[PDB]
Design a protein around this ligand. Structure first.
Ligand SMILES: O=P(O)(O)O[C@H]1[C@H](OP(=O)(O)O)[C@@H](OP(=O)(O)O)[C@H](OP(=O)(O)O)[C@H](OP(=O)(O)O)[C@H]1OP(=O)(O)O
Ligand SMILES: O=P(O)(O)O[C@H]1[C@H](OP(=O)(O)O)[C@H](OP(=O)(O)O)[C@H](OP(=O)(O)O)[C@@H](OP(=O)(O)O)[C@H]1OP(=O)(O)O
Lengths: 106, 332
């Protein structure tokens, strides 16, 4: 698999647009224009299919908007805690390592 | 309590079928541990193979999802940029829903990684307890370096998504500012004086009669309220107060030139001042207003801080002075 970056995808869009768009561009051509390290024909084919998929052409609304505001608020709060959790998981492992270095030396 | 197994399942059930068998096989791994009584027994190597396969499935799924999100982010950013605030009520609702949903899915991938990691630690702990081995520390050191655990560039995508939403689904910046400074009350109360007030400093009447304040509230809202209102009734009432305050400023010779020169943010700080001390009180800061008009931010700050107002309400005054300094909501 290929770790894509927003910068690398931007380059892929340009390459493909320069080759007449997603319905005219070939993976071989995109590969040649991009000249990217470790990028294969397989990666370009897999990336173009996802690109073509994401570009597929075909009470009250105030209450729906208020529901989106809460949906967003709750997603943002979970996101914040997940960032916090990552630091918690790292500290646990750091203390666990120290507890092991201390018991071997007693 | 942690209730890990129950929470992992509750989350898996809330995912689309493509996420089917993408999470940690926690139930399975706990059963395979029971079978464990290179100097490594076949049982131990087979169990370690299951853990490596788990990690492969996590990393392969995460980076594939990151890739989808990179494509989705660019596509949403273009749709938003092309439209340039000219979306219909129908179109604006659609794109907002799609970006809030996209944001949610990225937080879901972040939760997937947190839940998988938590369970991995629980499995290694049970493993080490069962084998007498000490491999949790090197195994988790390996995990803490894997794409799925680090979160990769997912943090940057959530940040970009949130930036599109700060423009597309905005919050009433001045309303949140004054609900912090003056305060938001949904029931008819009495101010510093003996007059009836509601919401964020909205005077109903100077009358001692509670029914005189009630009839004024039913007229302002347009319904039978009984003395209680909702957040949006209080927000629309405040928006009318802001418009009225701006109308007053724009017809004040001592306030209009400086208000016209300030940016939207520093204009909300000036409206805040007007709400607190009145148009006449604010127009009295001749020297400070001159510094603000001349865009001498720091000079205006040092000068506003020596006023009686700064000693009257220091918390509120400092927050307003910082808004004039920075030109941002970073004080609120
Ligand atoms: O958890 P239970 O409600 O008790 O169901 C169990 C259990 O299935 P799961 O744990 O995967 O849900 C297995 O038993 P354990 O390994 O957990 O002890 C299983 O397979 P086993 O032959 O290894 O016991 C067994 O039997 P089966 O799948 O043939 O129905 C089945 O049912 P029981 O409740 O009768 O044990
Ligand atoms: O009885 P349950 O409500 O189903 O919860 C139990 C158990 O609770 P008790 O030990 O108090 O009876 C433990 O819950 P927590 O440790 O999260 O507080 C945990 O068992 P272990 O941690 O000892 O493994 C857990 O299992 P899990 O690790 O999956 O969260 C789970 O048992 P079951 O999931 O098998 O039902």
């Amino acid at each position: 698999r290929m770790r894509w970056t927003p910068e690398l995808h931007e380059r892929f869009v340009d390459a493909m647009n320069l080759l007449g768009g997603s319905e005219k561009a070939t993976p071989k051509g995109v590969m040649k224009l991009m000249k990217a390290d470790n990028l294969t024909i397989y990666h370009v084919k897999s990336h173009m299919q996802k690109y073509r998929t994401a570009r597929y052409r075909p009470g009250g609304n105030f209450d729906l908007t208020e529901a989106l505001r809460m949906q967003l608020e709750l997603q943002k709060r979970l996101h914040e805690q997940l960032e916090i959790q990552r630091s918690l998981q790292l500290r646990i492992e750091e203390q666990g390592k120290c507890l092991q270095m201390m018991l071997e030396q007693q | 309590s942690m209730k890990f197994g129950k929470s992992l399942s509750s989350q898996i059930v809330e995912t689309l079928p493509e996420w089917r068998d993408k999470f940690l096989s926690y139930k399975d791994l706990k059963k395979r541990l029971k079978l464990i009584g290179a100097a490594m027994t076949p049982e131990e190597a087979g169990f370690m193979r299951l853990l490596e396969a788990e990690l492969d499935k996590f990393n392969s799924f995460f980076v594939e999802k990151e890739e989808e999100y990179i494509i989705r982010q660019k596509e949403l950013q273009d749709r938003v940029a092309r439209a340039a605030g000219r979306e219909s009520k129908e179109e604006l609702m659609r794109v907002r829903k799609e970006i809030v949903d996209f944001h949610g899915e990225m937080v879901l991938l972040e939760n997937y990684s947190a839940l998988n990691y938590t369970g991995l630690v629980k499995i290694l702990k049970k493993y080490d307890k069962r084998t007498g081995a000490l491999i949790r520390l090197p195994f988790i050191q390996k995990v803490l370096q894997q794409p799925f655990f680090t979160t990769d560039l997912l943090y940057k995508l959530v940040k970009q998504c949130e930036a599109m939403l700060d423009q597309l689904l905005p919050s009433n910046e001045i309303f949140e500012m004054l609900r912090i400074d003056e305060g938001l009350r949904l029931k008819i109360y009495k101010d510093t004086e003996g007059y009836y007030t509601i919401g964020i400093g909205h005077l109903l009447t100077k009358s001692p009669s509670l029914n005189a304040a009630k009839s004024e509230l039913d007229k302002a809202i347009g319904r039978n309220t009984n003395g209680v209102i909702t957040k949006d009734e209080a927000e629309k009432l405040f928006n009318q107060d802001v418009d009225a305050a701006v109308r007053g400023i724009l017809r004040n010779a001592k306030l209009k030139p400086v208000y016209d020169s300030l940016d939207a943010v520093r204009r909300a700080a000036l409206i805040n001042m007007v709400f607190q001390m009145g148009e006449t009180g604010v127009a009295g800061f001749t020297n400070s207003l001159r510094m603000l008009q001349q865009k001498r931010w720091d000079e205006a700050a040092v000068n506003l801080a020596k006023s009686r107002w700064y000693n009257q309400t220091p918390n509120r005054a400092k927050r307003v002075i910082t808004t004039f300094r920075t030109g941002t909501w970073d004080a609120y």
